[PDB]
């Protein structure tokens, strides 16, 4: 196979251009342009930089005596229709655009960024998530979830930012109303997991504290916002729970990425405690409870028909639910000047598990489809890659396990290779291409059916243990054989 290392330098993020297949890797003090085979095409230094979280960029040494040599782990790495988006942990989390194909050619870097252009989290231990979309006239847009960073000299958790503003010096800024207005950012401590787009809305998976609750505890939430809403009137928040909460902290999630369906409609979530667990939230069930929460807080003053409090205004904001007409949602589905906002369901979307892993703390999820069989790839805190079959049967079957690097957490940025024949797996210091179908290993029948993989089976026509698509002939499945040899 093939592996990528950087003399022990840590790898934060990974992104793939679906057009070229080129891989972009965001590391500490480094930016890497890698071929599909993990061959070095370019290197850019995010550099060790003399900085302090108590100073503002640009940093003139004379006005920052507290500065020490600071490392710049990558905080955000997204592929826009025309450029690479890069934000670092350093310099108040400012960003820059770079050419896809030659990351060394810088495209856009505001020369005097303002306090509105501090995009990413400036602490390398706080995570930043992002998403690139288009506005109503095609404008490139950056949606950013950013956790609470303390020393910073208060950036709202969710922000919509312009990538092609009229003035290229105002890039990475948000109109003062295209933000989520949270009061006590420190008492909600947002920890962001991922961000994805469904149709005309953006969604955010994150953990925050329920300040209205026992111990002000951390819960798992998903939130939705209309892509077009430049005022966040449409913002809703559902809490997510698996088995009531025996585990109860979403650590990673992904949708089924395959050749036939590129982005399915079920969100596979990994929870941890110690035992981990993998649950399914169908995304139409999320859109339902979100819509029910809107209708309740818009029309029935946050209460339901029986009168139970179902929805509520969220985050210290000074609004209340309303008795607006029943056709208000079907007339302002993304909100208005005077519709309740922001909103939260007091009723969680519960899921029962589909798989438990005892001594495993899951850190990464990725899902695809072979035939009609659904297959999950799961990374853990010990550098392991579990391959699991959920498919059209019942109760998941973990069928393989590998050790990418001992005791090194697996990165959630598990990406496929476009032909979905490989998976890119990273472990803090190592990035590896991984065959989804390790069939060739076994070259006789007893082997191909001993080592049991849903991808693999014995083509008797040829002399090979292979995928099905590699035979319209006679092929014996290794998982549910049905015959012998």
């Amino acid at each position: 196979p093939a592996a990528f290392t950087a003399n022990g330098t840590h790898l934060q993020h990974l992104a793939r251009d679906p057009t070229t297949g080129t891989l972009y890797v965001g590391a500490t003090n480094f930016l890497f342009q890698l071929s599909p085979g993990l061959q070095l095409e370019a290197v850019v230094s995010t550099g060790p930089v003399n900085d302090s979280r108590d100073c503002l960029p640009p940093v003139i040494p004379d006005e920052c005596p507290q500065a020490q040599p600071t490392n710049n782990p990558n905080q955000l790495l997204l592929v826009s229709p025309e450029a690479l988006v890069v934000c670092g942990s350093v310099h108040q989390g400012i960003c820059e655009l770079r050419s896809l194909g030659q990351i060394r050619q810088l495209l856009l870097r505001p020369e005097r960024p303002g306090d509105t252009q501090y995009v990413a989290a400036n602490d390398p231990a706080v995570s930043t998530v992002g998403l690139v979309a288009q506005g109503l006239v095609g404008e490139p847009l950056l949606f950013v979830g950013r956790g609470y960073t303390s020393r910073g000299v208060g950036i709202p958790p969710i922000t919509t930012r312009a990538l092609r503003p009229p003035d290229p010096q105002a890039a990475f800024s948000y109109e003062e109303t295209a933000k989520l207005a949270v009061g006590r950012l420190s008492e909600y401590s947002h920890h962001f997991v991922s961000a994805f787009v469904r149709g005309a809305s953006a969604y955010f998976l994150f953990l925050r504290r329920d300040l209205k609750a026992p111990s002000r505890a951390f819960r798992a939430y998903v939130s939705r916002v209309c892509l077009q809403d430049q005022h966040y009137y449409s913002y809703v928040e559902l809490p997510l729970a698996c088995q009531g909460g025996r585990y109860g902290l979403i650590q990673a999630a992904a949708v089924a990425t395959s050749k036939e369906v590129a982005r399915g409609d079920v969100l596979f979530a990994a929870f941890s405690s110690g035992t981990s667990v993998l649950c399914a939230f169908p995304l139409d069930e999320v859109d339902q409870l979100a819509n029910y929460t809107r209708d309740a807080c818009y029309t029935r003053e946050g209460r339901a028909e029986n009168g139970t409090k179902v929805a509520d205004i969220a985050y210290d904001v000074l609004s209340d639910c309303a008795q607006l007409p029943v056709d208000t949602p079907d007339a302002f589905p993304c909100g208005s000047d005077h519709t309740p906002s922001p909103m939260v369901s007091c009723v969680p979307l519960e899921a029962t598990p589909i798989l438990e892993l005892p001594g495993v703390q899951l850190t990464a999820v990725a899902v695809t489809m072979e035939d009609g069989h659904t297959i999950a790839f799961l990374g853990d805190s010990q550098g392991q890659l579990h391959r699991v079959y959920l498919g059209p049967g019942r109760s998941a079957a973990p069928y393989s396990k590998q050790s990418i690097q001992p005791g090194s957490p697996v990165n959630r940025d598990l990406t496929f290779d476009g032909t979905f024949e490989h998976l890119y797996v990273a472990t803090q210091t190592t990035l590896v291409k991984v065959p989804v179908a390790p069939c060739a290993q076994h070259l006789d029948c007893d082997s191909c059916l001993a080592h049991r993989d849903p991808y693999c089976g014995w083509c008797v026509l040829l002399g090979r243990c292979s995928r099905r698509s590699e035979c319209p002939e006679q092929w014996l499945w290794s998982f549910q054989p049905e015959l012998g040899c």
Partner: nanobody, 124 residues
Framework: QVQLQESGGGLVQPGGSLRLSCAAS????????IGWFRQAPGKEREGVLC????????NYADSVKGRFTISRDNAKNTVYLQMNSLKPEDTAVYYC?????????????????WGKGTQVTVSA
């Protein structure tokens, strides 16, 4: 809460020994390169000793050759600076930091995280 704690600093008699420790919390330092630094009053923060993620590479500052000793315990999430000999010019606040940069090496130029520091004072 990612944090680095320094312990063991205090007052000593020249020629004395002293063991400083650097406990990590909120993260495992198993794959980080750890470095000890110090800052005497008025002067710039210099580095004292550095160690790779594997412990296989250690690099010193010329002024402490054969006097100070670094060692790491990944399972304990702590790192120790054994300071023997001891000098009035050794008096400073000793900081401990971790880097995710070239961790298979003992360079320690840039740092990811820092400790609040513990003062070691040597009677003049």
């Amino acid at each position: 809460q990612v944090q680095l704690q320094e312990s063991g600093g205090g007052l000593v008699q020249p020629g004395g020994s002293l063991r400083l420790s650097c406990a990590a919390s909120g993260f495992r330092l198993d794959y980080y390169a750890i470095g000890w630094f110090r800052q005497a009053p008025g002067k710039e923060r210099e580095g004292v000793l550095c160690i790779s993620s594997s412990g296989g590479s250690i690099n010193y500052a010329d002024s402490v050759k054969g006097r100070f000793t670094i060692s790491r315990d990944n399972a304990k999430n702590t790192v120790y600076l054994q300071m023997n000999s001891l000098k009035p010019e050794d008096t400073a606040v000793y900081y401990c930091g971790a880097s995710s940069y070239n961790t298979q090496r003992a360079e320690c130029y840039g740092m990811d995280y820092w400790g609040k520091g513990t003062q070691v004072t040597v009677s003049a």
